[PDB]
Amino acid sequence: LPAPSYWKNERGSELLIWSANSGTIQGTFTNHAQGFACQGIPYPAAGSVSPTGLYFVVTFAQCNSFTRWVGTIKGSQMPTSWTLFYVDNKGKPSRLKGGDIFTRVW
Numbered sequence: 600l601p602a603p604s605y606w607k608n609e610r611g612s613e614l615l616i617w618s619a620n621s622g623t624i625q626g627t628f629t630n631h632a633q634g635f636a637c638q639g640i641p642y643p644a645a646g647s648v649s650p651t652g653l654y655f656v657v658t659f660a661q662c663n664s665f666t667r668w669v670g671t672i673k674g675s676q677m678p679t680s681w682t683l684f685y686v687d688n689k690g691k692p693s694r695l696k697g698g699d700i701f702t703r704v705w
């Protein structure tokens with residue numbers, strides 16, 4: 600994983616990877632995905648990269664939710680799957696799942 604580097608996914612969301620020291624990813628994510636909240640709010644991202652793949656987590660404090668992405672990097676493409684864990688308006692933990700493909704911008 601190149602660091603620093605900057606990636607955007609097909610939904611328009613932005614992932615800035617600032618460092619990957621000792622394999623620990625440190626960066627910032629901002630959602631721009633239609634159908635989701637916390638649009639435009641940069642949140643810290645944290646995870647791990649190894650020779651075999653990567654994952655990262657972003658906590659969306661204002662939305663009472665967090666998402667974990669898991670995937671790999673093939674050059675300038677980073678295909679992933681994610682799970683969004685949220686505490687709903689009645690306090691019930693729930694989840695949603697989907698995919699994302701991030702493409703390197705710089």
Ligand SMILES: O=C(O)CCCC[C@@H]1SC[C@@H]2NC(=O)N[C@@H]21
Nearest residue numbers: 612630632635636659662664666
């Ligand atoms: O709606 C929320 O609870 C917070 C924002 C969640 C955005 C998710 S993270 C997985 C998917 N990929 C995106 O680029 N945005 C959504």
